[PDB]
């Protein structure tokens, strides 16, 4: 599959799909999330009656925060990839004021919501999710893509209880090294913090943070201010809840490894250092891929368009100016 996958991806990467629907083809139902330049809304595609999640970004706000290239990355990558645990982009378009991405609606809510409410996940429930990320990072990294924003907030749970990765704002196709200070503080690898130049290994570090956080219910480095988190990441040592298994600790010690010649996922054996670790001894990797494993948790679902696995957000009307904004900047979107 990984052979056929790069071929398919490069074709879409090189000739991206553009302008494949219009705003007026969608009824706007409810906000499912926000960010600094817009929001994701539940919508219904009037023609098919299907529900989707629509991300709306304000072009002027994106320019203000100098995120043009990152938003062009997000859509170009998302329209080109294809994997069971990546949210599927269905349509993309833009108008005078906004950018739109219409994706699968993933009705189970964010892992974030379930994780905070429950406290923490059991090692088997955490492992189930971690396996899916391992495979998604194997796929992405095979295409020279770094994800750079792994966290429970970006992992949506579908009706089958499997993960769908969303929010590709910091994803970037890079061979070799890149330098942008970006990500979420709790999940940043030390090399990002230290402005060294860094590569796909930052995703493997982040996987360590996510596993820790799933299993403990809090992340390995927290504090009230980002800068204090950074200091812990760089100069501090990881300590584990007494309930962590010896195998979980050994895995996390190898993922939350400052030294790049020693970090799992960055060795010559690559992803298999992780796949063949004892913590994953119960994981049938092909069965996870094919979604044949019974999920440990299945969200409550009461028909489509139901949003009770999501928080409520203040609604505001989508405004579209009569004058085109930032046309040049977003030409290729």
């Amino acid at each position: 599959f990984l052979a056929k996958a790069k071929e398919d991806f490069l074709k879409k990467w090189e000739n991206p799909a553009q302008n494949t629907a219009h705003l007026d083809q969608f009824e706007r139902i409810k906000t499912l999330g926000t960010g600094s330049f817009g929001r994701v809304m539940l919508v219904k595609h009037m023609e098919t009656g299907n529900h989707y999640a629509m991300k709306i970004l304000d072009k002027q706000k994106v320019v203000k925060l100098k995120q043009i290239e990152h938003t062009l990355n997000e859509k170009r990558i998302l329209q080109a990839v294809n994997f069971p645990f990546l949210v599927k982009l269905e349509f993309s378009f833009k108008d005078n004021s906004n950018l739109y991405m219409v994706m699968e609606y993933v009705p189970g809510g964010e892992m974030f919501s379930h994780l905070r409410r429950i406290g923490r996940f059991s090692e088997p429930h955490a492992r189930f999710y971690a396996a899916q990320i391992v495979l998604t990072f194997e796929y992405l990294h095979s295409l020279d893509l770094i994800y750079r924003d792994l966290k429970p907030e970006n992992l949506l749970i579908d009706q089958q209880g499997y993960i769908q990765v969303t929010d590709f704002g910091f994803a970037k196709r890079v061979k070799g090294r890149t330098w942008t200070l970006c990500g979420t503080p709790e999940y940043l690898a030390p090399e990002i913090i230290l402005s060294k130049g860094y590569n796909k290994a930052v995703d493997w570090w982040a996987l360590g943070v996510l596993i820790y956080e799933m299993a403990a219910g809090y992340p390995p480095f927290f504090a009230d201010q980002p800068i204090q988190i950074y200091e812990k990441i760089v100069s501090g040592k990881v300590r584990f809840p007494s309930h962590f298994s010896s195998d979980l600790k050994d895995l996390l010690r190898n993922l939350l490894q400052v030294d790049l010649t020693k970090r799992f996922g960055n060795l010559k054996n690559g992803v298999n250092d992780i796949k063949n670790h004892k913590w994953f001894a119960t994981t049938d990797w092909i069965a996870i891929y094919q979604r044949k494993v019974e999920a440990p948790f299945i969200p409550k679902f009461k028909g489509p368009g139901d949003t009770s696995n999501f928080d409520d957000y203040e609604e505001e009307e989508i405004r579209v100016s009569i004058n085109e904004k930032c046309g040049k900047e977003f030409s290729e979107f």
Binding site: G35, S36, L65, K66, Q67, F112, R116, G119, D149, K151, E153, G169, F170, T180, L181, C182, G183, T184, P185, E186, A216, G217, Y218, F222, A223, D224, P226, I229, P241
Partner: peptide
């Protein structure tokens, strides 16, 4: 407890990305 320290911290909600 570490749990108590987390719950009392300002980082238990949805975390934003950073850009410089």
């Amino acid at each position: 407890t570490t749990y108590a320290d987390f719950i009392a911290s300002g980082r238990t909600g949805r975390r934003n990305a950073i850009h410089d």
